[PDB]
Ligand binder design. Sequence first.
Ligand SMILES: Nc1nc2c(ncn2[C@@H]2O[C@H](COP(=O)(O)OP(=O)(O)OP(=O)(O)O)[C@@H](O)[C@H]2O)c(=O)[nH]1
Ligand SMILES: Nc1ncnc2c1ncn2[C@@H]1O[C@H](COP(=O)(O)OP(=O)(O)CP(=O)(O)O)[C@@H](O)[C@H]1O
Ligand SMILES: Nc1nc2c(ncn2[C@@H]2O[C@H](COP(=O)(O)OP(=O)(O)O)[C@@H](O)[C@H]2O)c(=O)[nH]1
Ligand SMILES: Cn1cc(C(N)=O)c(C(F)F)n1
Ligand SMILES: [Ca+2]
Ligand SMILES: [Ca+2]
Ligand SMILES: [Ca+2]
Ligand SMILES: [Mg+2]
Ligand SMILES: [Mg+2]
Ligand SMILES: [Mg+2]
Lengths: 54, 352, 438, 425
Amino acid sequence: MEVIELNKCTSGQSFEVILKPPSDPSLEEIQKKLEAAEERRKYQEAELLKHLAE
Amino acid sequence: MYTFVVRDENSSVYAEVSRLLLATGQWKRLRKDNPRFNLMLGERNRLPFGRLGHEPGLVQLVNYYRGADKLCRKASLVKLIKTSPELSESCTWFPESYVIYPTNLTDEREVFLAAYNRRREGREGNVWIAKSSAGAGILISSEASELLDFIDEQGQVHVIQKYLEKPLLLEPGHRKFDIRSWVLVDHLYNIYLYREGVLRTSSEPYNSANFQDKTCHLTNHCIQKEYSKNYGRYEEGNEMFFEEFNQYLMDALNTTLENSILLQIKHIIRSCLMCIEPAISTKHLHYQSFQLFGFDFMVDEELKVWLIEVNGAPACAQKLYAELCQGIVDVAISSVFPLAPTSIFIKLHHHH
Amino acid sequence: MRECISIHVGQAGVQIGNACWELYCLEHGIQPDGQMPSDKTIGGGDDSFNTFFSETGAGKHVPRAVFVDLEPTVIDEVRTGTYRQLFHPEQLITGKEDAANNYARGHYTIGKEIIDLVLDRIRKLADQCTGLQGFLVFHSFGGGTGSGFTSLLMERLSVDYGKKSKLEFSIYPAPQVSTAVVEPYNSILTTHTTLEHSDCAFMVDNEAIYDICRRNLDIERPTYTNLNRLISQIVSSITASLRFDGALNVDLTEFQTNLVPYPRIHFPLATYAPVISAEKAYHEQLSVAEITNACFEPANQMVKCDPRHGKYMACCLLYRGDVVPKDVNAAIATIKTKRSIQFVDWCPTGFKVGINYQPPTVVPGGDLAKVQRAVCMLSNTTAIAEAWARLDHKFDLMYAKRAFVHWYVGEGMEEGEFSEAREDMAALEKDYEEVGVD
Amino acid sequence: MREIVHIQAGQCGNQIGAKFWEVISDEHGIDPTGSYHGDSDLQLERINVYYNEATGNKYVPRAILVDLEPGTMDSVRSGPFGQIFRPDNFVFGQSGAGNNWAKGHYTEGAELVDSVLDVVRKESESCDCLQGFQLTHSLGGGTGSGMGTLLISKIREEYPDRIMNTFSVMPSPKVSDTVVEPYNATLSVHQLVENTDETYCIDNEALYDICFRTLKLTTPTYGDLNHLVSATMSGVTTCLRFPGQLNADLRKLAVNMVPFPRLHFFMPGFAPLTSRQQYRALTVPELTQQMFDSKNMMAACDPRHGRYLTVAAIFRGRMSMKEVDEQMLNVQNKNSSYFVEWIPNNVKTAVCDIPPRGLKMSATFIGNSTAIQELFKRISEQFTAMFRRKAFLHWYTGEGMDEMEFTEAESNMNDLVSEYQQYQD
Ligand SMILES: Nc1nc2c(ncn2[C@@H]2O[C@H](COP(=O)(O)OP(=O)(O)OP(=O)(O)O)[C@@H](O)[C@H]2O)c(=O)[nH]1
Ligand SMILES: Nc1ncnc2c1ncn2[C@@H]1O[C@H](COP(=O)(O)OP(=O)(O)CP(=O)(O)O)[C@@H](O)[C@H]1O
Ligand SMILES: Nc1nc2c(ncn2[C@@H]2O[C@H](COP(=O)(O)OP(=O)(O)O)[C@@H](O)[C@H]2O)c(=O)[nH]1
Ligand SMILES: Cn1cc(C(N)=O)c(C(F)F)n1
Ligand SMILES: [Ca+2]
Ligand SMILES: [Ca+2]
Ligand SMILES: [Ca+2]
Ligand SMILES: [Mg+2]
Ligand SMILES: [Mg+2]
Ligand SMILES: [Mg+2]
């Protein structure tokens, strides 16, 4: 039961008590992900319009 | 209308409990994967406790205490007894035990040999038994070399504990036996002891000069019914019930089952269960738990009781399935889900 | 002094953000018009509260906050509410139609068209910071914006502000206050794509905040206002060290250092006590030992789970009010001898303690009663994995039938991102078990 | 500002639509002349969803009235609230459809559809942010059935990413105008399977039995049936017409009610349904028990013959929201065998403080149940009974249709039935 790093100021204090010792994607790659999904949406809408045109 | 699910098809106990619940006309069984249940008769292994108590408007109850394995595992019980201040120091009712890991994997090998060499040097009886939870795989021997070498040939954790060389022998027969007590713990953590126990007796005379033939030393019901030649001679199915056993203690020893054995059993059940209560209690939990336990005891010729092990998913004696299962429904299930005596249990009061 | 920018995304984040800044103002003595009589340096200063507030030449104290929602109705509350004067229009961003509880819609379809605008508004706040620490991101798991747009925002922040820390305050989905069936989908999608971008995340399970409100505050059917006022109390306790003088958790970096030794396991469990009803006659004031002991009761945890069957990697005790170190150590010694507190063998069995003498501020007319001392415990337990298990299981039930999947594919998401996200959660669950179970 | 454009086509569509605008106009305080005279701000909060605001604080419904003969729409224009509709929004021909799907869809209707889309386009151009469309019509006639589905097909082409919603009256032999109603209904259903996000299935037989057996009306009329549709239409749209986070807009409701794109046909329900003992206060248990009772449902399908994919319940009036959750959670936990177990929490509840006119409290029911297949089975059986003998086909081949198109519709709906069956197990 040891207390370490006791710091005191006007608004409070903090310390540490030890009981026992131990034993990314780039900007380019994000645009591609967004543009890839935007293309899959454009493809699926074209197939809908092609279906409606028939 | 209450709802329950069945997730252990091999449980003869809760199979009968499930049959009784439907007999009341106020409980309905659902598919085993339906989460909208009041009661879960769960699986033995890997029961998903984390998924309980998160259904809006449903009080959920389960038939197992999460964390009770600490008591029902051979190696866990030994570690729990030795490390718990409530037990280790003054635990005079549990045989001297040691946890031993096979050399192909803490470990109490050296501590075991130290106590072994002390007995061998003092002329004292030095017969130990090695067992594990992965058995049907038991060996009894008086040589440390054989015990340790038998564990290295396997691949799971084992426990070496003192073998009771002076057991109490029934007469006529001169035969060993053990005592099985069923204990029910409800959601409020009351400890109920079934008034009916069973002595699983050996139908062979106890022989202290030959630990090779393990039929007169192991009182398991399956071993007696497979490797014993006098099965069913003295009592039906090698099962003597308290009424007869009590009458015997009066005729032979001039004492009663209560005074000479039951007090110690009730004391041991309390000590074990109160010890782990802070770790497994569901008093302030989002779900509730109860569980049936099977305690196994040994009795020596001084009428001192010893704890062998605790079973977390015990079976029951055929003659007592109806009475006990109905009891599980009265105090364990209907106490939380009431329906629209002379209790068969004995409440062991204690401080929570 | 280093600044902290708070970002509020979606209905949950915005409304919780509104409740926190209401509490921050009451704590720092800031009026609804932005004035602060106690601040003697007019139009400037590098005080602790300046980490969350900037100053204008007229003496106004403006939160370093951005509010983002793909629909304008929730942010219109902020624009015309009590604290309307605090923020300027550049800080409030609203679209015209939401993500319809569809992660793919908020992340891809709608997010792609508004992401550059949000980054620009955030860049304007960053340009007022002389040494920016990082970001606090508030959002829900279930909302299509909270889940879908947040994960995109996090990816870009990692690119635009590489060396900056990012903490989260995430609302775990609870059916008692939800009408969305697909929230498990959104929760798991957003955890997958956000995991490598968040340094530390505090999950709050609405189920926990709900029962606390019914049990402790005697509210039969709590509203979001009740939940959010309680939630912002916990948030205040967690961010207090950044806004007041002190030496524990004085910057966002310290949260990771003190609470997350393993980067993926960055979800500390939060426990708060005491929560007392204001409608009560008058309560007996609880002691240091009693409130500290409450920190190990499941009933006051932000996520319901059983820490008795996990392992602790870190443990932080944040007290506010009349507390002295002597009383804290006394209580801890008692709890150790009674409770089941198992640490991992590669971490010290210790407690970092912080004490702020100013007791918890309570919103006038709110539901919480004034107390003389309170504590928030931050502990990294493997027990919080139960939350992932519950969530992952609901995911498995719907995905086995591909139910509702077409709504996501329709917005341009590939079906494979479902399984890719799920396999990540199965790996996350394995990490918890490798650290906690024997 | 999330506006909805309403369309009503054909005899049935306009008479039901007429009463719908009569009911909600009363609930929002709008009088027959468009002036607001309510006493609560909740009435105007979401008023712009169904009403445009004109000069002088006038509220004009965002509704388009369509038909191929003038008769019915002259009745509307002379009806109680006829003056409230925009005069330009009446688009009608003179030939009629003769209860013929091919005339509404291919010949007569084709000549008139473009001018209908000119009005739709004009109402959408004035929307701050259009949610989507809702169409009221019957499937058994020619205009609402044949031209209605033609409208949907062209509205989806010009507005491919908007929500298309319909209230569809299914024909029943017990309440029938002509024997060709199964033909028209089968042809329309396939259009709806493809081009609608949500379809409330209303069976004229269920409406009849309710008026006779429950309401004790010796001789029901179309007007009596339309009173139920009104109340129901007012109920399902309560989420959209008043403040609330649950089922906020049309796309959010669809995301939570439709697990598979083709299984978007709902069974609606209402409660109470009291006969003239009409002043008795109704308790929350009674509201919930009735709302889930098949007798209170309007698709004429027994829910205990299938399983609920998702359920959405709306409670109106000043009541105990706690007692609502308890009773809802009571019904689910008491019959969890009719709720699929692979969609956690598929039963959602919403509350609203403004009750319908003349009621202390009420509840509306919206179910996506696999039992709806029984409705399509009836239609298919009736279709096939005549088609195997090519009975009455000349009415349709005379309009340019081929037998091959009927065979496809037959298969398309039989596939629709098989899709429901595989999810019921
Ligand atoms: N604690 C709390 N939870 C909220 C609040 N508002 C919404 N939620 C929860 O958030 C989830 C729904 O997500 P939202 O935040 O409303 O969705 P969103 O981020 O606005 O995204 P959209 O789909 O576009 O609306 C549900 O689980 C709600 O219970 C709130 O004010 N406080
Ligand atoms: N230390 C000891 N001294 C004497 N006998 C012992 C003993 N340990 C075990 N036994 C004998 O072994 C038998 C049961 O062994 P154990 O209970 O360890 O195996 P097991 O768990 O597979 C049977 P069960 O679980 O049904 O009680 C008992 O009947 C007892 O007679
Ligand atoms: N509920 C209801 N159903 C109607 C009404 N009028 C007609 N129907 C039904 O609708 C079908 C006839 O369609 P109808 O609207 O007359 O054809 P249309 O004018 O060409 O669109 C038949 O099945 C009728 O039973 C009505 O006022 N109310
Ligand atoms: C064919 N038909 C049925 C009904 C009815 N039962 O209500 C009417 C109505 F016009 F009277 N017509
Ligand atoms: Ca200053
Ligand atoms: Ca990073
Ligand atoms: Ca012509
Ligand atoms: Mg055993
Ligand atoms: Mg939203
Ligand atoms: Mg007609």
